Structure formats: C-alpha cells, structure tokens
Design a protein around this nucleic acid. Structure first.
Lengths: 188, 493, 268
DNA sequence: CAGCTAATGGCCATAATACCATAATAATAGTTTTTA
DNA sequence: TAAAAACTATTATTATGGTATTATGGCCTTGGGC
C-alpha cells in the first residue's frame, strides 16, 4: 500500500518528469521493499505489490522515453532482475507479461542504446532474462528468441554490454524448439 | 566542464522604460544582447548553459517566491522555440506587452537579487565551470534610502565573487556610455582587449565554436631508454559543423536508422565472417581479412620517437600538406621534460634544429615520418600566446607529396615593374591579423538555421570580408594596374 | 580502394550489400521505408528540423569557380603553424600570351623582397564549390609559383590556460648535462653540412623515402597476391632501413644515449 | 552547312559519409583486512 | 570456514574527433563522309 500507494502515486505524479524524485522513490519503496519482509503478510502482500507494480511500470517506463527514466529503469530494472529471485514461480502472469515487456525494454534500448545507461538497461534485462525462465513457455519465448537472436546477431556496440552479443544464443538453446535452434547453430 | 553563462536585466523602475529617449529603451538593447549570446551559442553551439531572468519588477517568475523578480528560463543549452519563446520581447508592442503581461517595475533589493541569480547557479545539475553573469543596468543609484542595502551590496557581493560567481556591467550607455565611476566596484565582479558593447559579441560569435578541449593522449619514447608522454591537441580540425542529422519527414524525429548486411543475393543476412576486405585487379580478385588489413598497419604502436635533429630552415615550403594540429608534450604526468623538453626547445631552436619523429596515430596506423619543429613560447606582458611552447608537428614530405608537379622553363620579369609593383602592393597589402578569418559560406547555413531558431524572414546576413572591397581596390591603389597592363602587353585580356 | 568489403567463401559481391535499415524513432521505433526523411538536427537542447530543400535554396555559395586575391601582408607576424591546409597548389600560367606571367613574376619579386604573402579566394572549378585561403610564392630559382593553401580561419586557434614553460621555476638542473646532450643533438643532428655544398644531408632526408601504408601493403601485395594466405608478410628491413636513421648518427648518440639515463632520470 | 554533333566517351573535387576511436569524467568490481 | 568494509585497481562513459570511407561531385573525351 504505502508500497502501492506511494509507488503508483508518487510514480504517477512523476509522469510529468521525476528525476531524483522517482529514482529514490524506486529506491526506497523498491529497496525497503524486501528488507521489510514477512511470510504471509509481507510475502504475498508483496506478491500483489510486485504484481501491480509490474502492471504499472510496464506501462510507465514503457511510455517513458529515456531521460531521467533511463536512470529510473536503472533503479527499477536492477530491482527487477533482483526481484526475479523473489518469485521463482507464481510468475506466469508476470512470466509472459514481463516476457514481451522486457522484450520491449530491449526495444527501449533500441530507441537509444549506449551512453552510460542503456548499457545498464540491457545488462539488467539480461539477468532479468534467465532466472526468470522456468521453461514453462514455448513460443512466447521462442518468438522473442528469434529476433533477439537477430538483434544480437549484428550491431556493433560497446565493449561492455557485449554479453548480449552472445546473451541469449544458448538461452535460446534452453528453448528446445528446433528450427530457430537450427538457425542459430548454423549462424553461431 | 560545460559551463554557466548568464543574462540578467536590472530593474529599479525606469530601466525597461526608454528614459523617454527617442531610440530604444537600453533595456531593449539588452534584450537583443540576450538574443545575441543565447543565439550565439546556436553557432558556437556551446554545452555551456545560458540564463535568462529579470527582477526588480511588478510580478514574479521564480521559485524563491519574493517580490520584484522574474525567471525567464532555467539554465539551458538553447532551444529553437526557446529562442522563439523569448523572441516576443523586441518591439514597443513587445516592450510593453512583455512588461505588463509580466508586470514591469515596482521595487527591488540588491543582494537579494544576487542570490536570486546565484540561486540560478543553484540550477546546476551538471558539470559546469565558468560562473559568468551579466547585469543589464544604467542604474546610477541602487538606492540612497537604505544604505543597509549598500552594506548588503558590499556584503553579499564579496560572497558571490567568493562564490566564484561573476557578474559585471558592460558600458551600456547611461549617458557618456556611463558617467558614473565613483562607488562602483561591487556592481561588477592570453593578452586581450575589452569592449563596452554587444556588436563585438554579435559578430565575434557569429561563426564561433568550441573552446575547452584536450582529449586523446599519446606518448613519445625519446630513446628506448627515456620517457615522455605527448599531449595531442587540435589548434583546430579545420573546424566543421556537427553534420546533417537523420530525422524522418513528418515524424520530425531521429530515424534511428541502423545498418548491417542482409544477403544481397538470397534474402538472408551477411556477417563480417561471411565477408572480408579485398583488393581486385585485372583477372585476380584477392581477399584478405579486415583484421589482416587492420593489423597490416602494425609496426610498433601508437606513440612517438625522437628520430633526430634537422635545420629548421632546411625546409620552408618546397612543400606543405595536412597540418600539424598541435601536440603539446605533456609535462605534469611526465615532467623534467619540463626541463628536458624546455632546454630541448631552447637549444634546438637555438640550433635551428628540430626533433624528427615517426608518429603513430590512435589504435595504431601505419605510422609516418613527420618532423617536429620545436615550437617556441611567445607571451607578452599579458601573455598573448601565438606559440604555445611545444612542437610544430611537421609532416615529412613523401613520394605522394611529390607524386607529380610539372617543370618547364620560366620567362622572367624586370625591375622596371618592381619599382612600382612594391608600393602597388603596399596599397594591396594589409597588416592582417589573427582574427575575422573564416569560410563563412558554411557559416551562412547556421545562419539559415538561425532562421528557424528565431523563425524569421531573412538571416542576420552579416559581414566578413572574405571578398575584396572595390572602393578600396580602385581607391588606395587606383588604376596603376593599367601601367602594369600595358607595360609588356596589349592584352585584350 | 576501400579494402573491398565483398563476400567470403565465394568473394562474389552478389550476396554483398549493407542494410539501409531506416527505423522509426521511439517506442518500438519500427521500420520506416522510402528512405527520404527531412534533413535536420538537434543542436543545443534543440532539435533542428529542416530539409535538404531549405538547405539547397537557403545556401549562399560561390558560382562555379573563382580565384581572387583578397589582399596581402608581410610575413613577419606570420607563422608556419599558421600555415594550414593539406592540399597545396603550385599555380602556373594560362600562358601563350605569357605577359601577365612575366608581370606575375614582377609582383612575385614584389612579394619576396618584402616577405609578402597572398590572401586569395579560391573556388575550385569543375563542379560547384566555394572556398577561400592563403596562397604564397615559393622561390626555388629555376622555377617558382604561388601555392594555394588554407588560411587558418579565425576559429582555428585552440588555446589553453597553460602555465608557461617560461616558468621553469619548478624545473631546472645543472646545465652541465644539458650542454652535453646538446652535443648529442649534433651527433643526432640528422642534417649536418655535407658535400661542402652546405647541403646538410638530413639522415632521414624525407623525399624519395616513402611512407609505409602503401609500402607495407605492397609487400602484402606481392606476397598474398602472388602467394597463398599467410601470416605477417616479409617486412624486409629495407623497410626498417627507411624506418630508422643511420647508426653513425645513432652510434654518436649511444654514449649520449647513456648520458640521458645517467644525467636525466625518470619518475612514475 | 556550317562544322558534327553533343551528349558520347571520362571524372576529378568536394562535401558528405563511414569507422573508429579517446578523456572527459564519472562506475565497477576488486583482491586484501580480520570475524566469525 | 566465510565474511564485513574496503579504499584500491579495473574495466567500464562519451564528444569529439579524427581517420577512413562513401557518393557522385558537373566536367573533359568520342565520334564519322557528308
């Protein structure tokens, strides 16, 4: 609630631009998210908290162009990929939702890559990527896998983020469906 | 790093008024001054940020929530409709409407204003250095009534200068250009001159460009056994624009176009693997790796080597090509080339001798033979530096340099000419300068962009002479070129 | 040539071309087709929407060509560094009716006596360009011309806060090393007086001694062109002969190369 | 025609572009320290 | 055992260039018995 109210509210006023305001916001409610934790009350209370801030930020920073909010998705995306391990499962709504979500966060790097942040962008999406993965999907991922495996198939980029260059190339391997696997191991 | 520069207009009352004078309110003159530097940083395109604020007035624009202020804009590198947004403010209709619509003049209090604009130095979120501010006032008397305001001037003033933050008052014509000397110090805050006006500002920055830059730092091993690291510097690059940027049509927005290689036969892709770097001639196509190419450069490494000592006068121009930009040998990191490099230049210049090097550009190259003249160190009383101590980075001449140039006979002149020719040139000569020299015909386009910047009719359409002025040509010298013309010839041109 | 970037495994350029791939800007920023776009910028904080049209029209220029003396000056205030450019024009007559080439010589020696330099517009002819630059007579007795070159343009001077080397007050040794390594500077003087023609033959005498990039490649060219793929091809030291000065000078540097290390230490 | 055109054969400068490649800064992590 | 900071170093940042490259750049060359 203060989690949820303070997040959707202050984060909402932030839709006129936030800068430090949002980020620390993202920090405190995000960071003081888990350090304040209890089974029952706080565990599943979060489960809805996390749940509906998912539904939020997909919208929120999806809209948000880059600006402050490249750094807002520093704060978040870090808190995201680390909040994967929070729920190994009960992911399914947020499995798929975050699936094409962070897909489009690759896309948000695709708007503007590089600088300092967009590194942090795709990088944080990468650990966002796998510990997420239970298998449990087929072409919800595989679809993504395809032209991820294009998006990294190419694209001279910084020395730093180059993990993505290879990032999903075997992660698509953990996606068992053949013919894309064919595509890659031919290509790779 | 990308710094602060600040416009401000004083207000007591009559300032936005014209003093009932029949030209302009010097307030407005200031207006176009603001225009001029903010616009100026279109051209110069300076990551320095600019300030537009007034005070001393009826209503307010601020966050400090006090009487007699207005913000105009927060610190910025400019904007086109930041320009336009401010462009309302010329003209008596815009004088007034600007005034009243914002409200114009009641009272003020001085150092209050200080930390006003200073507290626009609050506005810094980024890396700036220069704290530089300008007040626009004819005010002869800040006040006589409360000299506690005066103590406040002499009080917070020293703070704000001590803040490293610097405002002065240029000589903006209160009568005499000002008649006041008297108490004025507080109001205000490599050998040059100073000016009282904007015109200097205007033209001076019409073509102007970047200032603080030194980046990629190489080395010179002198021998194998001893060290210097060499600062690479551009006196200029033959400065050019930031070049045409991709923005799509109605969307107006950056394309974020990308490029890679599809297969150009089959609908597939292509990869740097899948290709290579070739030379082809005649029958034989020959293909060798982009790597193989890029390391075929390899001889040593980026870095430099004293290769010897040569008469400076040995080569003046039999020759010339792509310039030295100026490497200053670094001495902080590696000093003693403080001393070493010092006496080096001392005596090598004394010898009229120079240090040849083989320069190896960045991420290797094939390196090249280039002389280094020792560059002398020129400073006057206030230290005009024409010759920052260093080296002339002197490309050597090579085959390509001489790849071709003709030779044949030459038929020669007579002193009968030179008797006149000399003074003729004395009429054709000018003492020249360091300054007002460019290729404006490119400047004219960031004029053409000054257009959309102001969104107006015709550019500044300013004046440099890169083209000769006929009245002087036919004036000082005259037609004596006739004498020359019929000297040896009835030309018919 | 560019290092022709074409195919591997075939070499056939048929598969070969790069990807246009023009995109939209943001929020999936997807493909855009029909390459045409406006031609614009950001500058400052401001996007600079604009076209190629308003460019072309709004652009003042030269005509198709011209070359016009912009004036003259003495050479005293003038500096080699402040000779700028790369391309340089030996300029000879349109002759046959050579008269104004002779009077040209007249103005030339009107320049050379008084150390006089030329200030001239130059618009290159064949296709549509304005330019402006310095030009100056060079004198080598048998034949001479004026050379068009770029006048360094007022922006062209970068200048720093640099504290003077005129201040050595933090750095001085005893001269007693400095003089000696001067004598080195002689032993390392590349051009010393030779032939008693007062032609000091600069070891590394520039000139007929080329630069690698081409030479280097050329060895790559005979090798790989004429022999199969290999690692680094012969660097044959005639290469490095050129690269490195002669060791009578260098030998004469050796013990001075010693006095370097000895007399002149290092830090870091 | 008159002379063959005259756009054919050629194409150099550019500007543009690219790659492509750093400091100006600001981070990472980092391996030690014992603590436990 | 790790386990704590930890000031250190790293490699991370571009803004800014320079290469290097593209492209034709609007021109000089080619043609045929009437």
């Amino acid at each position: 609630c203060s989690l949820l109210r303070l997040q959707e509210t202050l984060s909402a006023a932030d839709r006129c631009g936030a800068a430090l305001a949002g980020h620390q916001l993202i920090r405190g409610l995000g960071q003081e998210c888990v350090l304040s934790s209890s089974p029952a009350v706080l565990a599943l209370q979060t489960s809805l908290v996390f749940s509906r801030d998912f539904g939020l930020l997909v919208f929120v920073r999806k809209s948000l162009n880059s600006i402050e909010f490249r750094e807002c998705r520093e704060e978040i995306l870090k808190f995201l990929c680390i909040f994967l391990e929070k729920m190994g499962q009960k992911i399914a709504p947020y499995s798929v939702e975050i699936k094409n979500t962070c897909t489009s966060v690759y896309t948000k790097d695709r708007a503007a890559k590089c600088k300092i942040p967009a590194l942090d962008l795709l990088i944080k999406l990468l650990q966002t990527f796998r510990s997420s993965r239970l298998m449990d999907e087929f072409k919800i991922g595989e679809l993504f896998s395809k032209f991820y495996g294009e998006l990294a198939l190419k694209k001279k980029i910084p020395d730093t983020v180059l993990e993505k260059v290879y990032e999903l190339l075997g992660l698509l391997g953990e996606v068992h469906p053949s013919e894309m696997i064919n595509n890659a191991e031919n290509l790779f | 790093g990308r710094d602060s520069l600040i416009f401000l207009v004083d207000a007591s009352k009559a300032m936005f008024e014209s003093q009932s004078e029949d030209e302009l309110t010097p307030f407005d003159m200031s207006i176009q001054c603001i225009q001029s530097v903010y616009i100026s940083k279109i051209i110069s395109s300076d990551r320095d940020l600019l300030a537009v604020v007034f005070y001393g007035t009826e209503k307010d624009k601020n966050s400090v929530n006090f009487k007699n202020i207005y913000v105009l804009q927060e610190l910025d590198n400019p904007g086109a409709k930041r320009i336009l947004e401010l462009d309302q403010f010329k003209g008596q209709q815009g004088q007034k409407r600007f005034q009243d619509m914002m409200g114009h003049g009641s009272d003020y209090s001085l150092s209050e204003v200080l930390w006003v604009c200073a507290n626009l130095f609050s506005d810094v979120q980024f890396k700036m250095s220069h704290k530089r501010i300008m007040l626009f006032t004819n005010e002869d008397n800040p006040h006589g009534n409360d000299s506690a305001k005066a103590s406040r001037a002499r009080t917070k003033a020293g703070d704000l200068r001590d803040t490293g933050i610097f405002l002065d008052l240029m000589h903006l014509k209160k009568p005499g250009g000002f008649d006041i000397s008297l108490f004025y110090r507080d109001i205000i805050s490599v050998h040059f001159e100073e000016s009282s006006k904007l015109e200097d500002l205007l033209r001076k920055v019409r073509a102007k460009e970047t200032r603080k830059r030194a980046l990629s730092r190489l080395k010179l091993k002198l021998n194998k056994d001893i060290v210097i690291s060499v600062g690479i510097y551009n006196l200029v690059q033959k400065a050019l624009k930031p070049p045409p940027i991709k923005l799509y049509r109605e969307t107006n927005e950056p394309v974020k176009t990308k490029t890679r290689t599809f297969n150009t036969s089959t609908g597939g892709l292509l990869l740097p693997s899948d290709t290579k770097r070739s030379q082809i001639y005649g029958s034989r196509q020959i293909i060798l790796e982009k790597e193989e190419t890029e390391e075929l450069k390899r001889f040593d490494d980026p870095g430099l080597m004293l290769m010897g000592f040569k008469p400076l006068v040995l080569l003046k121009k039999h020759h010339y090509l792509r310039p030295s930009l100026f490497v200053y040998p670094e001495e902080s990191l590696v000093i003693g080339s403080s001393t070493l490099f010092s006496a080096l230049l001392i005596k090598c210049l004394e010898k009229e001798v120079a240090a040849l090097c083989r320069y190896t550009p960045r991420r290797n190259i094939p390196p090249y033979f280039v002389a280094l003249v020792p560059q002398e160190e020129e400073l006057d009383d206030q230290k005009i530096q024409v010759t920052p101590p260093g080296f002339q980075l002197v490309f050597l001449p090579f085959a390509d340099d001489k790849r071709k140039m003709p030779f044949t006979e030459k038929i020669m002149a007579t002193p009968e000419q030179v008797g006149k020719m000399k003074a003729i040139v004395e009429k054709l000569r000018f003492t020249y300068r360091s300054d007002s020299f460019e290729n404006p015909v490119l400047q004219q386009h960031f004029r053409n962009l000054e257009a959309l910047a102001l969104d107006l009719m015709e550019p500044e359409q300013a004046v440099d002479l890169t083209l000769p002025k006929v009245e002087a040509m036919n004036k000082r010298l005259g037609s004596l070129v006739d004498e020359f013309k019929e000297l040896v010839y009835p030309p018919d041109y | 040539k560019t290092w022709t970037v074409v195919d591997a495994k075939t070499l056939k350029k048929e598969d070969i071309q790069k990807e246009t791939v023009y995109c939209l800007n943001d929020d999936d920023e997807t493909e855009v087709l029909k390459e045409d776009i406006i031609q614009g910028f950001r500058y400052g904080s401001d996007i600079v929407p604009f076209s190629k049209v308003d460019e072309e029209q709004m652009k003042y220029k030269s005509e198709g060509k011209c070359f016009s003396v912009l004036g003259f000056c003495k050479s005293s205030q003038v500096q080699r560094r402040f000779f700028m450019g790369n391309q340089v024009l030996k300029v000879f007559a349109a002759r046959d009716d050579e008269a104004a080439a002779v009077a040209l010589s007249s103005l030339i020696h009107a320049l050379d006596d008084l150390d006089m330099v030329a200030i001239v517009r130059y618009a290159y002819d064949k296709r549509a360009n304005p330019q402006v630059g310095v030009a100056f007579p060079h004198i080598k007795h048998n034949y001479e011309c004026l050379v068009y070159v770029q006048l360094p343009f007022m922006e062209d001077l970068r200048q720093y806060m640099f504290s003077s080397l005129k201040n050595s007050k933090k750095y001085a040794p005893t001269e007693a090393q400095l003089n000696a390594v001067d004598a080195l500077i002689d032993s390392m003087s590349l051009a010393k007086k030779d032939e008693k023609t007062d032609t000091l033959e600069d070891l590394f005498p520039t000139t007929k001694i080329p630069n690698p990039r081409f030479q280097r490649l050329f060895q790559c060219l005979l090798h790989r062109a004429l022999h199969p793929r290999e690692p680094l091809p012969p660097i044959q030291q005639h290469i490095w002969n050129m690269l490195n000065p002669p060791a009578e000078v260098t030998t004469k540097s050796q013990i001075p190369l010693s006095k370097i290390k000895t007399l002149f230490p290092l830090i870091e």
